[PDB]
Amino acid sequence: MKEIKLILTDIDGVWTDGGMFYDQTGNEWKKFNTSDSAGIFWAHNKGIPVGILTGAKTEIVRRRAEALKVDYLFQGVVDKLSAAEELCNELGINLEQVAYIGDDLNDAKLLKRVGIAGVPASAPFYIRRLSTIFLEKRGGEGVFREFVEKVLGINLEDFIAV
């Protein structure tokens, strides 16, 4: 199991089922899973920072990232690979030391280049097949939590200890 010094994640399709609610005025909702917050916990327990890369720019994600003590947030990302480089360079780590989870076309380049790639079970096939680990969960089912636990090797003794 590789050495991971950064954990990065997409939001829609990973922390959610891809759901995007719109009301008659064009306001938007998203639905996260409380199970995913434990992903942050295990990460921080092992001394690893967590970053979010998203193409959108919403208070929804800013707040949720704030709720969960996420270390790095990049919104309005036009090129997720560029986003991860920048952050890696700033952290002084290489892409090989990154575990990233994404679910769609704009996640492909970065997924083909990270140390560990995860893709939820809900995702398109040609993205799915880029996953270097088996994830059973679908987007919004707690797959970010599943991703982190597997990447970090969280066992029973890990659970007991906390």
In the complex, the residues that contact a copy of itself under the rule CB under 8 A are 12-13, 17-35, 38, 41, 58-60, 62-64, 103-105, 108-109, 112, 122-124, 126, 140-142, 145, 156, 159, 162
Contact predicate 17/122, CB 8 Å: yes
* Rounded Cα gap, residues 82 and 108, in angstroms: 12
Q: Which residue has the tokens 């991703």?
A: 147
Min. distance of Cβ 106 from a copy of itself in angstroms?
A: 8
Q: Choose among Mg ion, a copy of itself, none what residue 23 binds, the Cβ cut-off being 5 to 8 Å by kind.
A: a copy of itself
Contact predicate 109/127, CB 8 Å: no
Min. distance of Cβ 92 from a copy of itself in angstroms?
A: 27
Q: How many CB atoms lie within 10 A of CB 131?
A: 19
Closest CA to 87 of 111, 68, 71, 64: 71
Site for Mg ion in 69-128 (CB under 5 A): 103-104
CB-nearer residue toward a copy of itself: 3 or 157 = 157
User: Which uninterrupted H or E stretch holds 39?
Assistant: helix 37-45
The interface region with Mg ion, picked from 10-18, 80-88, 109-117, 129-137 by CB under 5 A, is 10-18
Min. distance of Cβ 98 from Mg ion in angstroms?
A: 17
CB-nearer residue toward Mg ion: 18 or 49 = 18
Min. distance of Cβ 14 from a copy of itself in angstroms?
A: 10
Query: What is the token pair recorded at 3?
Result: 């050495």
- DSSP letters, 100-115, are EE--SGGGHHHHTTSS
Q: Choose among a copy of itself, Mg ion, none what residue 92 binds, the Cβ cut-off being 5 to 8 Å by kind.
A: none
Helix (H, G, I), strand (E, B) or coil at 158: helix
Which chain residues interact with Mg ion by CB under 5 A?
Answer: 10, 12-13, 103-104
